[PDB]
């Protein structure tokens, strides 16, 4: 019923009670483990998960059972016993991201959860006016390189219509440029998008680090292009502390990670454009961003340069190549006085917040292959921690691409 | 698409389902409500018998000879003898067979594209533990074959009812002694605190070192365990030094060439084989990285990045990360000038690829324990990282099993 949890490095252990409280099937059965998998294959239950989310709500502000308590879980149920659905107070939305924020297994950055600034975009009714609401996003999440959480909430979705939606996976990305030879100029992730913005009008550039524009839709209309203006979009050029060359390898990275393709649900309610940002963990940038294969794929450029024996794996020059390309980047943030975490300090941070989480809640929702980061797994101490992973509510859900 | 799982190459963009899962006939500790895939420990005539009819469908599926008058008289014949003394025996074939598919369907090893290649020495007729240490040195002898390692598997008499277990005491057959200090502290291998207490009071006298062989503890049915020492020309050692790194050589750090786990139950059929030793040779992260890196092994990153003079105050100048490689690579090097067998772990992990795809066409997929095949240093780097894997039980199986004292 309960499961032990133990960390191997400690020899400490824990039960998770937490988990009892899961009311949404992950994609695990007896028969066989799915849990590596990155993407999963009435008026009564709207009700039901309203009613436990205003449960949570006024459980967390400790007026349990109250007066205010009683006459909102009367609002909800009139309203939707009358129009099929309801609406969340401001101050209820916000308790809600922060809790969505919490309960997600995937993220690694969690000691920061109760510190999140929640814009209220609920009022947009144009793509022009979601185009503002995110350029305030940005301008606020950035303040200068002093990065800050921050989450920006368009209308939630409604049984008559089409979403509000932004097409872009982040607010910022780099273009990916398809060529004749079948290579890619640019982030090979994005050729995708990057074809879309041309088809809807962009003129593109011809560079490896073109900031893509926004696509962005309001219910059942065509997309609408919007260019950020560069002022707003806080860049950093990669150096390395010793190595010279590295600079004119003219790579480099946007400040400000911002997804903006998750759904948020809270008490039942659906928000399909809800962009989140906070700060980059290094290796993101630094191992997948510039080295995964399927990416900037620099690992080979990078070891050459640094006159590496390319021609046998057990020289070891990628892993060498790896760690003075994590170097780079942390180097290069603190030096351009943008908050970034190391996954040293942020893996130590995690193990904290699942101490404090075990004292809160009984247990912490963590998913093992994406809180160990992507080098040196095993030098950090959550490879050595056991995890329970399972969906809680308030929730971001992964959702299908618009197009 | 087909109501089997779905699995994707995320570096490639392949997909392939997985049928061979239908096969599984033992429950995991996942349910819907929660994954516990990262848990490292997860907890009669008629049970017997079906697990036994499985079995030898398999063996007859193998040789090609299903629904043949020789696989019905195995089946008749292993069901009278189950019938008249509740257990039943393997066949020489039987064993070397059950051996290799135990080994090929071990969700966290990485090194099984050798599966075919195993020799199975059969030990069945063992009778004390004296022989139990003959056996096991002429495993020793013939899996270290001076450097050019050779895998292998020793199988001891199955378990019987009412009567004690063959059991191998030592998680390996090679393992570093752990001497508990004075200071609270350990010299040698913190893992083998509790075997090295338990060697020296079963009468061993112990040593001083940082990387003492432990004796063997071996024990017959019914009998205490006795003690054996591994005479040293046989246990090959391979010193560390660094291929420019002139001082690595000057820290004293060692390891052994032979990988060999002696603690884990092999079940086939039905039958429980609680002593058969296996061996393989390395991969190197498991050395460099988790032998000579864990917090609670050697821990010898902080030494090595002093050396290096790295500045140990602050994560983000990665020292932890620049140590780990240095060791890692010392390990590759020392291994291969010393012309003992070892494997990185990007070709390791290549060929774990290939060894997906060869059984995806065999048997239409592969059970695999993510958190264990991808590497505990420079994970994405391999190409195993951006692969989804099922993970499910098959048998024949290797099981852990409690440390019998
Ligand atoms: C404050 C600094 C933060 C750090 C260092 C951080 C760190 C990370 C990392 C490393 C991942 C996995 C990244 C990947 O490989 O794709 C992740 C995932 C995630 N984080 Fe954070 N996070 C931070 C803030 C936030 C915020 C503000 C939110 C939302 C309010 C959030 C919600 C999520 C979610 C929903 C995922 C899963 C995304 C997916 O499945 O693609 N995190 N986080
Ligand atoms: C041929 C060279 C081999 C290589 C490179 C190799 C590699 C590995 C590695 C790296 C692990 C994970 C070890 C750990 O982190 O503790 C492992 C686990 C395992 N391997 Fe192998 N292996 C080899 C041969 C064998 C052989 C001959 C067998 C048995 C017939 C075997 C069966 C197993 C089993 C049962 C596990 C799981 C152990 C546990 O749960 O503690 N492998 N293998
Ligand atoms: C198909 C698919 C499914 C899924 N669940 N996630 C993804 C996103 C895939 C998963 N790894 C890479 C890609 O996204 C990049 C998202 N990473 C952001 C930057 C994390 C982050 C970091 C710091 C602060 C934040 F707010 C968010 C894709
Ligand atoms: C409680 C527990 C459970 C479990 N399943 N394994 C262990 C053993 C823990 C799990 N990782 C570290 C420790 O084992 C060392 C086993 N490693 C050997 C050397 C693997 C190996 C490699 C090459 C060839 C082989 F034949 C075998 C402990
Ligand atoms: C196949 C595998 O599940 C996939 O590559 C995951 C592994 N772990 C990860 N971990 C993080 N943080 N981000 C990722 O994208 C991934 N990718
Ligand atoms: C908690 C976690 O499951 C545990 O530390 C695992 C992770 N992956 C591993 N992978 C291998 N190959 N060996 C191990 O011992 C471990 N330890
Ligand atoms: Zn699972």
Request: hydrophobic share 40%; with cysteine; aromatic share 10%.
């Amino acid at each position: 019923k309960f499961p032990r949890v133990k960390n191997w490095e400690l020899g400490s252990i824990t039960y998770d009670t937490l988990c009892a409280q899961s009311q949404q099937d992950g994609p695990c059965t007896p028969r066989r483990c799915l849990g590596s998998l990155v993407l999963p294959r009435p008026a009564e239950q709207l009700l039901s998960q309203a009613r436990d989310f205003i449960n949570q709500y006024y459980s967390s502000i400790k007026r349990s059972g109250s007066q205010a308590h009683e006459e909102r879980l009367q609002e909800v149920e009139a309203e939707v016993a009358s129009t099929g659905t309801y609406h969340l107070r401001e101050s209820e939305l916000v308790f809600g991201a922060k809790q969505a924020w919490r309960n997600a297994p995937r993220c690694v950055g969690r000691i920061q959860w109760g510190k999140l600034q929640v814009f209220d975009a609920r009022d947009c009714s144009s793509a022009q006016e979601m185009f503002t609401y995110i350029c305030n996003h940005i301008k606020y999440a950035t303040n200068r390189g002093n990065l800050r959480s921050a989450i920006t909430v368009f209308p939630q979705r409604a049984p008559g219509r089409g979403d509000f939606r932004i097409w872009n996976s982040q607010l910022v990305r780099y273009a990916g440029y398809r060529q004749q030879d079948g290579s890619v100029r640019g982030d090979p992730a994005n050729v995708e998008i990057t074809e879309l913005c041309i088809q809807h009008g962009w003129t593109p550039g011809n560079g490896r680090f073109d900031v893509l524009p926004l696509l962005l839709q309001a219910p059942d209309e065509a997309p609408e292009l919007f260019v950020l203006p560069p002022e707003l979009v806080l860049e950093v050029p990669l150096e390395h502390p010793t190595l010279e060359w590295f600079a004119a390898l003219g790579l480099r990275w946007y400040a400000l990670p911002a997804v903006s393709n998750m759904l948020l649900e809270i008490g039942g309610l659906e928000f399909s454009a809800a962009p989140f940002s906070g700060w980059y963990m290094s290796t993101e940038i630094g191992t997948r961003n510039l080295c995964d294969p399927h990416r900037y794929n620099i690992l080979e450029d990078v070891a050459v340069c640094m006159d590496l024996d390319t021609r046998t794996t057990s020289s070891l020059w990628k892993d060498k190549a790896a760690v003075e390309i994590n170097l780079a980047v942390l180097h290069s943030f603190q030096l351009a006085k943008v908050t970034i975490v190391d996954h040293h300090a942020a893996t130590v941070s995690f193990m904290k917040h699942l101490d404090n989480e075990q004292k809160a809640r009984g247990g912490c929702p963590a998913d093992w292959a994406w809180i160990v980061p992507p080098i040196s797994g095993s030098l950090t101490p959550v490879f050595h921690q056991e995890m329970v992973n399972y969906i809680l509510s308030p929730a971001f859900r992964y959702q299908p691409d618009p197009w």
